[PDB]
Structure formats: C-alpha cells, structure tokens
Scaffold this active site. Structure first.
Site, short mmCIF file in Angstrom:
data_model
loop_
_atom_site.label_atom_id
_atom_site.label_comp_id
_atom_site.label_asym_id
_atom_site.label_seq_id
_atom_site.Cartn_x
_atom_site.Cartn_y
_atom_site.Cartn_z
N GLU B 10 9.84 11.65 -4.18
CA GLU B 10 8.61 10.88 -4.12
C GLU B 10 7.43 11.62 -3.52
O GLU B 10 6.30 11.37 -3.94
CB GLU B 10 8.83 9.55 -3.35
CG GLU B 10 9.76 8.60 -4.08
CD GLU B 10 9.55 7.13 -3.76
OE1 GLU B 10 8.75 6.84 -2.84
OE2 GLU B 10 10.20 6.29 -4.43
N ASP B 19 -3.34 3.57 -2.75
CA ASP B 19 -2.45 3.62 -3.91
C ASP B 19 -3.19 3.18 -5.17
O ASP B 19 -4.36 2.80 -5.13
CB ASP B 19 -1.19 2.79 -3.66
CG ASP B 19 -1.50 1.32 -3.36
OD1 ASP B 19 -2.60 0.83 -3.70
OD2 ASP B 19 -0.60 0.66 -2.79
N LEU B 31 3.38 1.33 2.87
CA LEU B 31 2.19 0.48 2.83
C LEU B 31 1.94 -0.13 4.21
O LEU B 31 2.86 -0.69 4.82
CB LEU B 31 2.38 -0.64 1.80
CG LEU B 31 1.22 -1.59 1.48
CD1 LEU B 31 1.50 -2.30 0.16
CD2 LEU B 31 0.95 -2.60 2.58
N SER B 116 26.95 0.19 -15.45
CA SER B 116 27.06 1.32 -14.55
C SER B 116 27.50 0.88 -13.17
O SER B 116 28.23 1.61 -12.48
CB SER B 116 25.72 2.07 -14.46
OG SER B 116 25.16 2.34 -15.73
#
Ligand code: 0VI
Lengths: 263, 160
Positions: B10, B19, B31, B116
């Site tokens: 990231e 943002d 945030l 999955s």
C-alpha cells in the site's frame, strides 16, 4: 660478514610467515565453500536472513580467491612493469575488500530493522548496498590512480598521496555507523525487550554475543598494521607470525560466525 | 513482518495528505477525520501521537497507528461468521495475508471468496490459489494478488 648471516636469518623467518599465510588462506577458502553449500542446500535460503549470509560468504570467497592471483603480481618484475592485468587484479581485490565491509554493514542494518519493524523483494536493497555501491567508488579510485599514481600496479605506497582514501574513508564511515547501530540494539534490548521472548529477540541476542566475540578477533590485525613494532628479534618473530595467523584465518573466523547464526 | 508487508503493498506517507474522496489521512492509510477542517484532523492526531501534533510523524509513529488499525481489522474479522473459523485455523504468516486482503477490500469483500475460504480451512492450499486467481481482484491489482496468494500457498515470507 656476520651481517650477511643476519640477513639470511630474516629471509628464513619471512619464508615461514609465507607458509602460514598460504596455508591459512587455503583452509579459509575451503571453510567458506563448505558454509556456502550448506546455506544453499537448506530451504531456509529463501529467508531474507539467509540471503544476506549467503552473499556475505560469497563476497569473502571471491576476496580469498583473488588473494592467490595477487601473489603472482608481487614478483618485483611484475610489480614494476605496471602492466594492465597487474592493475586490474589489484582493483578487483580492493573492490572485493570493499564489498566485505558493506556486506558486514548490511548485516547490521538487518538486525537493527528486524527488532524495530515487524523477503525476495526487500533483498534488492541489500544487494544494491553490498555489491552496487562499491563499484563507483572503485571506479573513482581508479580514475584517481590513473591520473595521480599510475605506478606499481596501483598497490604502491608513497607518503603524500591520498588516493586510497577514496575507498578507505567510505570503509571507516560504515564502521562508525555500525557502532551506532550496536549501541542502540544493546540499549533497546536492555530497556525494552528485556522480557521479550520473540524469535527475533532470541536471535538478536545470539547475534550480539557473537558480534562481541568477533570484534576483538578481527580488530587486532587492523590496529597491528599501524604498530611499527621494532627490531627486537623476539618481537619481530612473534609479531610477524601472530599477525600472519590473524590475517590468514580471517575467512575461517567469518565462516564459523555465519554458520553459528544459522541455528 | 506484517508492517513491511502492508508497506510494500500500500505505501507509507509521513505527512498529512488528502485521499481521493477528500478526507485527511496519514501513515499506511490511516484516516483521521472526515471533516474538511484540518484542525480537527491534526488534533485527532495529537491524542493518538501523544506528542506535538504536527503534519509530519515519525516512522515509528506510523507503526503504532498501523498497529491500532491492525487491531481494528482482526476485531472485524472475528465478528464475521465466514471469516472467523478460517482465521483460527491458520498460522501467523497466512493470517497476515488475510489481514492484507481486509485492508484492501474490507471484511465484506473477503467473505465473498466462498470456495477459496473453504479450501484454505481444509489446508488445500494449491486449490485455494486457483480459485483466488479466477477473480476480478487478480485482474485489477495482479502483482499484489500474486504476492498474497503465494504467502497463502507456502506459508512463508519469501515473496515480500
Ligand atoms: C560495529 O561492528 C559490527 C556491528 C554490528 Br551491529 C554487526 C557487525 O557485523 C556483523 C559488525 C562488525 C564486526 C564484528 N566487525 N566489523 C563490523 N562491521 C563493519 C562495517 N566492519 C567490521 N570490521 C572489523 C571491525 C574491527 C574493529 F576493531 F575495528 F571494530 C571491518 C573488517 C570487515 C571484514 F569483513 F573485512 F573483515
């Protein structure tokens, strides 16, 4: 007269040192090669930690290997010719010498980061520091050799030229920084992490003990270079013998150091 | 290692930035406050940092914020009835890969990977990887997706 007998005595003692130095380098080269294959065989080679050990060992194998070829440049005839391959062998040897310093610096960077920030991509940073930063330093040193000291295969020593500082001063700087790292690791480990039992913490403590053991062993030879001891026959015989043992077994010491940490 | 993992995937920013939707954020995607006022953003920072509240933070300060967010992520994971049992059956390396996914798509996104998720709880890791790769996620951020799957397949940090 008996002065000549005094000269013949010195050559015999120098010749013994040379056997110490060759045998030590042979033993060290073999020890490093065994450690290298052991590291590569294990599936733990994919850890960032073992990648660093493996590159460090490789760096020492090349240096110990090229030491033999340097011996063939020390013939007085070759030393004075300053032929091209003469200087290339010296420069490769200094480059490998420098990689040895920066890879030991890399190990200290890992241990400081490992205990403070919770593998194949991150390695490129260490490969770029260990292998890549020294190359331009050596080139710069070479341009300086080409231009102010183009003699004696660049292994000449003359007072008043400071060309070798181009590569020697970077060496001292990364050792300074590695000392700052060691104080913070010790401070961190003694204050916080005093009760920590994470795997990184146990390995860090094992490192700190080994590093403390190795630091005296490697340090005597660096200081001994500056000693200028004297002309006592007893002082000369031991000084040369003890120093030859220490320089020549350095690779062997580093291979025990790396294997021990693998545990 | 989880901190370096999210940091590759990231990014890390050490000063306050805004943002795409315009709120104030810092660190690895932390945030502070949705208000357009920076003052409320910076102050929300002062309490967490416990220092002179400034736009720039220490890299160390990033990891405490990051750690607080990692708590919040695991707390969400445990609340979700499809996520909780797979998380408990997993080693520490594979858990991080799940937390990685939650950072990217939220808890609701991960709960949609139904096949999955069962393959992973049955330790059928090779089949989990084929299922995960047949998704829109894999196509939109492929290099990150290949790293996270690889962590699932082997249980090692080798890819990061
Ligand atoms: C701080 O330390 C430290 C710290 C830490 Br955390 C880590 C480490 O490692 C792991 C270390 C180390 C050693 C133990 N040694 N070292 C170093 N580092 C550097 C940079 N360098 C050196 N050297 C020696 C020293 C000595 C004296 F005495 F001077 F000290 C040089 C040489 C190198 C070669 F390779 F070439 F041999």
């Amino acid at each position: 007269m008996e002065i000549l007998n005094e000269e013949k005595k010195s050559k015999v003692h120098y010749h013994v040192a040379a056997i110490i130095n060759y045998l030590g380098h042979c033993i060290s080269l073999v020890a490093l090669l065994v450690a290298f294959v052991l590291f590569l065989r294990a599936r733990s080679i994919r850890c960032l930690r073992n990648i660093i050990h493996a590159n460090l060992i490789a760096a020492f194998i090349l240096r110990n290997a090229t030491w033999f070829v340097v011996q063939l440049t020390m013939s007085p005839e070759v030393h004075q010719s300053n032929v091209g391959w003469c200087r290339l062998v010296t420069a490769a040897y200094n480059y490998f010498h420098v990689t040895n310093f920066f890879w030991m610096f890399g190990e200290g960077c890992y241990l400081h980061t490992a205990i403070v920030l919770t593998d194949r991509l991150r390695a490129w940073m260490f490969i770029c520091i260990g292998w890549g930063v020294p190359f331009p330093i050596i080139v710069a040193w070479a341009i300086g050799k080409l231009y102010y000291d183009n003699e004696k295969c660049w292994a000449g020593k003359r007072p008043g030229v400071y060309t070798d500082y181009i590569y020697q001063g970077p060496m001292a700087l990364v050792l300074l920084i590695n000392f700052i790292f060691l104080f913070n690791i010790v401070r961190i480990l003694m204050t916080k992490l005093r009760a920590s039992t994470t795997s990184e913490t146990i390995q860090a403590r094992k490192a700190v003990k080994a590093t403390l053991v190795l630091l005296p062993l490697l340090g005597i030879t660096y200081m001994l270079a500056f000693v200028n001891p004297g002309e006592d026959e007893v002082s000369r015989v031991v000084f040369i013998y003890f120093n030859a043992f220490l320089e020549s077994f350095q690779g062997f010491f580093v291979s025990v150091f790396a294997c021990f940490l693998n545990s | 290692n989880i901190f370096e993992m999210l940091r590759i995937d990231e990014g890390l920013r050490l000063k306050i930035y805004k943002d795409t939707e315009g709120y104030y954020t810092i660190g690895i995607g932390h945030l502070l406050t949705k208000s357009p006022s920076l003052s409320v953003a910076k102050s929300e920072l002062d309490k967490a940092i416990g220092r002179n509240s400034n736009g720039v933070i220490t890299k160390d300060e990033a990891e405490k914020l990051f750690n607080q967010d990692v708590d919040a992520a695991v707390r969400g994971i445990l609340r979700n009835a499809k996520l909780k049992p797979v998380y408990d059956s997993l080693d520490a390396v594979r858990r991080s890969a799940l937390i990685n996914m939650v950072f990217q798509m939220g808890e609701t996104g991960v709960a949609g990977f139904t096949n999955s998720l069962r393959m992973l709880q049955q330790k059928r890791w090779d089949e989990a990887a084929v299922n995960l790769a047949k998704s829109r996620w894999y196509n939109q951020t492929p290099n990150r997706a290949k790293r996270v799957i690889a962590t699932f397949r082997t249980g090692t940090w080798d890819a990061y």
